[PDB]
Amino acid sequence: FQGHMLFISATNTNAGKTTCARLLAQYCNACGVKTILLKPIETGVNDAINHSSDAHLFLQDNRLLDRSLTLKDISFYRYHKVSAPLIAQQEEDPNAPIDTDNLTQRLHNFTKTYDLVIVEGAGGLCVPITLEENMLDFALKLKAKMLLISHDNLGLINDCLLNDFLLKSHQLDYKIAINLKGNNTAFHSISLPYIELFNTRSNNPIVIFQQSLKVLMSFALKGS
């Protein structure tokens, strides 16, 4: 086959997509699985003045494999507004709706040259990209596997399970992984006991990202 593709979404903005994506791509590359990081859509940016957007961080990592990469090779629709992409596009670029067919082509072209293509979304599964499509729809069009990153705070149970319900209702392979931050041991006392129970009762368990680099590389690469 050509390279595999893994979409990274989240329970909430700031849950840890970018941190986790970069740690997973680093692990994969260290294991000889040639992996690129892409941020096709990004809001809240001003590239004239700031070089630490998600796409810039991914570009830094990516140039360790290809010096010739530039920002426009890995991020395609970029907006100043800190909002859903649909809204940002309508306000800043009214004559250029986001074209997910184009994005699908561009992202799949990287499966020629990489073993794994990691695609970070924006905003969450239900966040609108176009009038007709949300991030999940985009992931479905890509035929990617899905890694949903959860925050590690009170509330994670509800948030994970809301996403579980949406994902299990669609035809894609997915995992949910909690981004368990340093210095949080309330998690183990408050939320973990339910995660444990859920995992005995579910055929698709919720994992802890930090425990799961090998498992998640296996997931991303398995099969066709």
Place this chain on the structure above:
Amino acid sequence: FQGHMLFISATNTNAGKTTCARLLAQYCNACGVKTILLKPIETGVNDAINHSSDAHLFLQDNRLLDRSLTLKDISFYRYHKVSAPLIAQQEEDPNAPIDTDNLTQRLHNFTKTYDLVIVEGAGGLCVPITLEENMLDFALKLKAKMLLISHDNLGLINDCLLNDFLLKSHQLDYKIAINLKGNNTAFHSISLPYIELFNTRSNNPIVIFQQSLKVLMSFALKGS
């Protein structure tokens, strides 16, 4: 018929269930719709030392209609742990799993004496009560209408739509209302434009709670 019943859930703990419930019951009572507030399950409490839990606030309001009410008349399963109810119950009261058949009886008994029975949940729709049931399951067993309160911050779009997807997938009447706090005008610039779009495209619109006291009383009381 006997009195109507409205369940109040939320996108997230602290979104504003209790504030909104109390404002809606106050409005209803001022309109001559005799309304009680119930908090059947509550975690994170210590009644020996603190009298400002949700049940205590509801009791304050409720005693304006019935001096004889006490806390145990309106809240039935109460735990110290700040966690999902299932976990709190398993740790603090291992021999008494929450009995939603009992709760259904107790809550319906209030439809004899009230025009509207408002029931606040805990935690969120997917938060576990028993091994088999979450808050949504409880609401379904009650045959209540559902009011889902959303926070007003960036992220509300995703959160509302995740809940929308779950609710529309089940057989109940529901509304989603944003608790738009004082001093937030970012909402109108960032999130409202999408809410507006969504509402033109949906047969069940997302409303703003503060604009909607009349509409929400109408919703709660309509029909059987």
